[PDB]
Amino acid sequence: AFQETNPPAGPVRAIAEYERSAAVLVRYPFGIPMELIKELAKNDKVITIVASESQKNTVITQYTQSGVNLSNCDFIIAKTDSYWTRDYTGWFAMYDTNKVGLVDFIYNRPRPNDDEFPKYEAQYLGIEMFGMKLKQTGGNYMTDGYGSAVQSHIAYTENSSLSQAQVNQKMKDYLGITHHDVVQDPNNTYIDHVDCWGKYLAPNKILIRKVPDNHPQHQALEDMAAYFAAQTCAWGTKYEVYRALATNEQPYTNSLILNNRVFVPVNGPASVDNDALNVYKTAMPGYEIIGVKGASGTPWLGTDALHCRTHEVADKGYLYIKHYPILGEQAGPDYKIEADVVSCANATISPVQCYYRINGSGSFKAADMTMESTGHYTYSFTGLNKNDKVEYYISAADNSGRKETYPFIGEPDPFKFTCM
Numbered sequence: 281a282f283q284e285t286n287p288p289a290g291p292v293r294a295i296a297e298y299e300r301s302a303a304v305l306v307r308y309p310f311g312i313p314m315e316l317i318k319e320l321a322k323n324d325k326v327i328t329i330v331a332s333e334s335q336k337n338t339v340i341t342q343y344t345q346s347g348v349n350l351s352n353c354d355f356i357i358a359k360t361d362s363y364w365t366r367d368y369t370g371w372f373a374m375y376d377t378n379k380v381g382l383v384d385f386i387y388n389r390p391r392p393n394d395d396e397f398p399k400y401e402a403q404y405l406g407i408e409m410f411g412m413k414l415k416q417t418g419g420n421y422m423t424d425g426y427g428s429a430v431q432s433h434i435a436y437t438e439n440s441s442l443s444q445a446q447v448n449q450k451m452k453d454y455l456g457i458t459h460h461d462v463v464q465d466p467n468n469t470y471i472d473h474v475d476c477w478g479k480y481l482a483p484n485k486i487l488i489r490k491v492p493d494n495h496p497q498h499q500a501l502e503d504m505a506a507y508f509a510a511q512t513c514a515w516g517t518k519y520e521v522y523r524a525l526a527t528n529e530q531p532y533t534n535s536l537i538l539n540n541r542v543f544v545p546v547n548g549p550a551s552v553d554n555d556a557l558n559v560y561k562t563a564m565p566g567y568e569i570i571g572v573k574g575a576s577g578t579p580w581l582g583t584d585a586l587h588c589r590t591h592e593v594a595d596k597g598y599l600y601i602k603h604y605p606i607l608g609e610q611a612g613p614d615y616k617i618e619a620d621v622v623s624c625a626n627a628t629i630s631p632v633q634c635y636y637r638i639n640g641s642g643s644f645k646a647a648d649m650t651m652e653s654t655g656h657y658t659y660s661f662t663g664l665n666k667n668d669k670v671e672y673y674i675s676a677a678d679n680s681g682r683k684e685t686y687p688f689i690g691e692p693d694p695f696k697f698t699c700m
């Protein structure tokens with residue numbers, strides 16, 4: 281059964297889907313095509329949930345026959361009621377400066393095996409688990425990694441014995457959420473999950489579903505796009521709002537960001553699918569955008585597609601870069617950046633660098649950042665003239681072999697500012 285615990289030792293920071301992932305969780309019997317599992321296993325660890333050793337063996341046979349990369353296949357043996365790992369598996373958060381933890385909750389469906397699964401997930405991964413006493417579902421949750429979370433109104437109505445203030449306080453305590461952005465669902469379906477209409481693509485980018493002008497939900501979705509366009513994101517700029525046009529209820533926002541790859545469910549027609557994939561390519565330079573056809577037995581639905589049947593797993597030894605960039609018109613006279621770098625692997629960090637380019641000319645140059653205090657690094661851009669345009673990103677490495685950049689994708693999408 282659900283076990284309430286004290287929240288994690290602070291400060292707490294929920295991890296975003298576009299941060300480093302060590303694995304992806306899927307479940308058998310399958311709700312996803314074998315081609316998706318094969319694609320995932322090329323570069324990432326795929327953890328398949330099975331109910332028994334016999335089911336594990338059945339799945340290994342199927343993976344071997346389909347040419348899945350077995351060297352990237354792991355298994356968790358636990359009973360589950362469904363393949364919606366997005367919704368019932370635990371949520372990841374950093375706490376106590378450099379630890380990765382799992383947050384359990386009361387799954388909002390009558391699925392006791394699914395509801396119990398986070399306990400087996402935490403034990404499998406070797407991390408601590410915290411029990412947040414809220415009725416929740418992962419499909420109705422997304423965080424920017426900077427203390428904001430977007431959820432539809434069911435986060436309140438399915439916790440109606442608690443005040444909104446108490447619900448917000450639990451999200452703050454267990455996940456570090458300082459802006460619990462609870463919105464009226466615009467999609468007109470029974471499910472009321474954010475992932476069927478909205479997705480943070482980066483701290484400063486949000487993808488919102490779009491439908492034809494004559495569709496009954498056209499204005500609700502246009503209103504939702506305007507709502508985020510007027511908001512200041514974690515980096516201090518207004519959100520970049522991208523739109524994926526669903527001409528016929530195609531679940532284009534129901535994608536999975538896994539490290540440098542994005543898996544987008546497609547169900548036709550080809551031209552409309554390709555238009556949606558091109559939105560992701562424009563929004564996410566440097567990422568590999570992959571269109572994924574559905575399984576014939578369990579097709580993608582407008583209320584249930586690829587994101588709904590997967591869940592990313594954070595790196596328990598995460599090399600985390602905390603950075604608030606300097607963007608747009610910078611008054612100066614100083615152009616100083618700061619980054620906090622912590623290793624959840626308790627690995628020795630070196631080097632910490634700033635990669636930069638001036639007036640988009642030549643190649644990116646590397647400069648060492650100064651460690652001013654433990655985990656706190658700084659860099660000042662010197663010799664810059666009026667109207668100089670700077671491109672930069674942060675890079676860190678540690679002695680466990682981890683290598684991370686901020687932004688995650690690095691060089692293909694750097695921070696940009698102009699000297700005033």
Ligand SMILES: *CC(=N)NCCC[C@H](NC(=O)c1ccccc1)C(N)=O
Pocket residue numbers: 364366367389418419420471473475476583584585587588589
């Ligand atoms: C999109 C997401 N994060 N989750 C989708 C969960 C779909 C699931 N569907 C059903 O329960 C269902 C059963 C039988 C027929 C149709 C739908 C759910 N709502 O939990």
Ligand code: NA
Pocket residue numbers: 360361362
């Ligand atoms: Na079942």
Ligand code: NA
Pocket residue numbers: 282368384385386387394395396397398
């Ligand atoms: Na649970």
